[model samples]
Target: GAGQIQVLEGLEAVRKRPGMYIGSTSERGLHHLVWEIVDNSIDEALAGYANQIEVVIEKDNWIKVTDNGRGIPVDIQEKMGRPAVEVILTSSVVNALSQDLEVYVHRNETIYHQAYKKGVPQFDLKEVGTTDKTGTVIRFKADGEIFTETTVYNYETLQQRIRELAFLNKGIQITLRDERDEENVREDSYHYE
Candidate 1:
C-alpha cells in the first residue's frame, strides 16, 4: 500500500520554521503579534471597507484586537482545503511576528535570543461574530518568560500611533483606549451597544 504525501506551500515554510522567518522568538516577537493584528486592520481601512480598530492589552499578558472591515473571508478555498481567510489570518500573524523580529534584530543585534530565553509565547486568533458584516478579532497571549515587566498599556503612545494612522489614511477613524483604570473599565469593556 502506498501512502499519500502532503506538500506545504506559500507561508507554510514560515509557519514551519517560524524562527527562520521571524528572526528570533522573544519579547519583540510577542509584541509583533499586536502589530500584525493592527496591520490587518489597516489593510481594511486602505480598502475603504473599515474605519475603526481597537486594541486592548489585558492584565494577563493577553491582547485583544478588533477591527470593522469585511470580516476575514470565512469562505473555503479549494487550493488549501480550508478557509482562505483563516489560513491568511493565521499565517499573517506568524509572518508579521517573524518580520518584526527580523527588523528588530537587523537594527539591534542583542535581541536575537530574547524570545527563547524566556520561552516562546503562544498566540490565538479568532473572527468575532458580527452583525456589521465585516471585521476580525485576534487575541494572543505572551510568554511570561519574555516579559518580566508588565507590558504596560500606554494610552498616549497608542493614541499617537492611531492618530498617525488616521492622518495617513485621511478619512478613516482609528480609536485607541487604555482602560486599565478601574473606573474607566466600565466605559471601555464593551464595544457593541
Candidate 2:
C-alpha cells in the first residue's frame, strides 16, 4: 500500500456537455481536438525532448499527430492502476471527444499499442512490435455525432496554426501532410533556427 492515491475519473461529464469542456461542438471544437493533441507534442518540444513533430490528415478526415519525444511513459502508474500512457491519454479532451482514438508508443526498443472509443479503452495496453526508436503516434477521428456542424477539416486552418507554432518555437521541425486525396497529396514542413 505504498504508492496508492487516486480518484477514478470518467468522461461522462465531457460527453454529456461537450461544450463545457471544448467550448463548442462546432468546427471550432473539431479543430480544438487537433490543437489539444498537437499541444501535447509541442510541450515535449518546448522541454527540449522533441525536435520533430508531424501532423497528417489521413483518409476520412482522421488526424494523426506524431512526435519524436520520449514516448509516453509506459510503466504502470501507481495511482491509476493502468499504464501511464493510458492514464494520460484517456484523460485527454481529444480522446474523450473522438469517435475512436489509438496510440502507438515506441520506447525501450519496443512498440506498444492501445485503442479507445469515446475515452474507454478497447483493450488492455499491449506490445505490438519491436522498435529502436522512441516517440508517440496518435490517430483519432472526431465524433461526428458531437461535431454536428461539420466534421470536415480545412487544410489551410491547420497549416496556419502549424506555421504559427513553428514560428514561435524557433527550432522545432513541424510538418503537415494531406493524404485525404490520393491523387493530390500535399505536405508542408516548417522549421526556424
Candidate 3:
C-alpha cells in the first residue's frame, strides 16, 4: 500500500506525437535525441562525478551514450512501482521518438540491464552480470517512422560537439568512436587544452 503511487505518466503523448516536445521530426529533432542524451552525460561531467564520457555511433544509425560517472540507480522506487532507472530509461527518455531503448548499469562487478521497445518495458533489469567496472551505457535507436532520416547521426558533428564539451568541462574526457566504417576507423579523445 505504501509502494504504488504513480502512473506511467507523460509517456504516451511522447510516443504518440514525438514532435511537440522536439519541435519537428526533422533532422534537427533527430540530432536533438542525441543532444538530449549527451546533455545528460555532460551533466555528469558538470557534477564532477565522472571523468570519462563517450559516444559511439554504431551501425544502422543506432547510437550509444556512455559515462563513467555515478551510475543511474536501478533500485525500486516506492511510488513508481518500478525502478527509477526504468522510468528514466524508458521510451520517453529522449526528446523525441521511437526506438528500442536500453539502459545498462555496471556497478563494481555486476551489471544491470533493461530494454524497452516504444515505451513498453521488456522487464529485464535482471542483473545480467558484468565483468566490467561501474558506469552507465544508454543505447538508443531512432524510430524510422518518427524522423525523416534514418541515418543522420554525424560523427563529425558529434566529435565537434564532444570536443566543445571537453573544452568547457576541462578535464572531462570525451571520446567518439565510429563503428560504421572500419576502413576509416576513428577514436578521438578530447581533453582540457
Candidate 4:
C-alpha cells in the first residue's frame, strides 16, 4: 500500500500557509529557507564527513548550498518507490516554498540531477555526469508569489549566521559568496581549525 499520498498533503500545506512552516513570508522567513538547507550540511560536518560548506547568492536571487558530505542516498525508498533525495526534497519546506529547485548529488563517482517546481518533480532522478567527489548541491529560487515582501537576500545577514556556524564547528570551513552582481563578486570564508 502506498503511504506517500499523505506526504504530498503536507507539502501542499507548506505552500498554502508558508508562514506557519516558516515564520513569515517576509525577509526573515526567506532567510530561514537557507538555514533549513544548510542545516543538513552542518549535520554532515558535525558527523565528520563534510569539511567544506559553501553558500552562494547567485544571480536572480537564487541560493545555492553545497557540501562535501556523502551525497543523499540515491537508492529507492521502499515506501515511496522514489529516490531518497527526491522524497526528502519534495517533502521539505524549502522545496515547497521555492518556485524552482535543482539538486545535484555527487556520490559513487557519479552525479545525479533532478529539478522540481513547487515541490513537484519535473523529471525523474537521472545521472547527469561523473565526479570523483561525494557531496550535494542544492539551488533554489524562492516563489515570488509567496514571498511578496522580498525575494532578494541580504549578504550581511547570511554572513552573520555562517560565521557563527563556522566558529561553533572547529574543523569545518564555511564560505559565503555573493555573485548577484557579475561586476563585483564578494566572498567570505571561515575556518577555525
> Going through the candidates in order, what is the number of backbone clashes in each?
6, 0, 1, 0
What TM-score do all the candidates reach, one by one? 0.59, 0.95, 0.88, 0.97
TM-score, model 1 to reference:
0.59
Q: Give the alpha-carbon lDDT of every model.
A: 0.47, 0.90, 0.75, 0.94
Residue by residue across 81-115, what tens digits does model 2's lDDT show?
A: 78999889777778878999999999999999999
Q: Which residue runs does candidate 1 get wrong by more than 4 Å?
A: 1-29, 94-132, 145-153, 184-193
Candidate 2 weakest lDDT stretch, 10 residues: 1-10
Model 3 C-alpha lDDT per residue in residues 11-98, reported as the tens digit of each score: 6667667777887787778878888888887887788788888888888778888999778887787766677777676535472264
| lDDT of candidate 4 over 124-151, digit per residue (tens) | 9999999999999999999999999999
Each prediction's RMSD to truth: 11.5, 2.4, 2.6, 0.9
lDDT of 4 at 104: 99
Pairs that collide, model 1: 22-98, 25-115, 26-115, 69-135, 71-134, 71-135
Candidate maximizing TM-score: 4
Provide the lDDT at 22 for model 1.
43
Q: After superposition, how far is residue 65 of candidate 2 from its true place, in Å?
A: 0.4
Task: Report the C-alpha displacement of residue 83, candidate 4, in angstroms.
Answer: 0.7
Compose the digit string of candidate 1's lDDT tens values, residues 10-48: 344545554564454554455555665677778877888
Worst 10 residues of 1 by lDDT: 102-111
